[PDB]
Amino acid sequence: PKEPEQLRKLFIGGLSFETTDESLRSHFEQWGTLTDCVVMRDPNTKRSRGFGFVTYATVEEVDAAMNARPHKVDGRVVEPKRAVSHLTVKKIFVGGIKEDTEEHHLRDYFEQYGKIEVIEIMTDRGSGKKRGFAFVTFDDHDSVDKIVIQKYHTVNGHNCEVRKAL
Numbered sequence: 001p002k003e004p005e006q007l008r009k010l011f012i013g014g015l016s017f018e019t020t021d022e023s024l025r026s027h028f029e030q031w032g033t034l035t036d037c038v039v040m041r042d043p044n045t046k047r048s049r050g051f052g053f054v055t056y057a058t059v060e061e062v063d064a065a066m067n068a069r070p071h072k073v074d075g076r077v078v079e080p081k082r083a084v085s086h087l088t089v090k091k092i093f094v095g096g097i098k099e100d101t102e103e104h105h106l107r108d109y110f111e112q113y114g115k116i117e118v119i120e121i122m123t124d125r126g127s128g129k130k131r132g133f134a135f136v137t138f139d140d141h142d143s144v145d146k147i148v149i150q151k152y153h154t155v156n157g158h159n160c161e162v163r164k165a166l
């Protein structure tokens with residue numbers, strides 16, 4: 001059973017105009033099997049539009065490619081991003097954590113998606129009581145992109161609602 005193709009794609013921006021289907025493929029095949037690899041071009045001039053996409057056989061291969069950033073492809077540092085589900089942010093809202101979820105619950109779970117820089121457990125401005133949601137800020141957007149395409153997040157026994165924040 002193959003993961004949906006949308007979740008196996010990487011959009012690559014900032015290409016050198018000299019990058020070709022073949023040179024993009026040779027580069028990104030270092031991190032997995034590519035079922036598709038396309039440089040986008042003008043339909044009339046054939047001049048590169050400066051971006052393209054690669055499709056891996058598995059999500060773990062996408063992860064490997066993202067973990068190998070920065071990618072310098074044909075002399076230029078490119079910008080890979082997972083396909084849209086792009087709203088490129090480093091912060092998530094985590095809701096449904098109730099009053100008993102602490103910083104270490106959130107850290108122990110989310111640190112396996114990426115490097116955490118800030119955890120903000122929200123409290124009532126008047127009483128100081130926990131409001132039941134939090135924000136987590138990572139050092140990079142791919143953490144967030146992995147998180148929000150999951151159907152489920154279980155933290156401290158709570159089924160949480162997680163979305164991109166600002």
Ligand SMILES: CNC1(CO)CCOCC1
Nearest residue numbers: 148150151152160161162
């Ligand atoms: C769309 N499904 C979710 C709802 O926000 C997103 C990931 O976190 C919880 C499940």
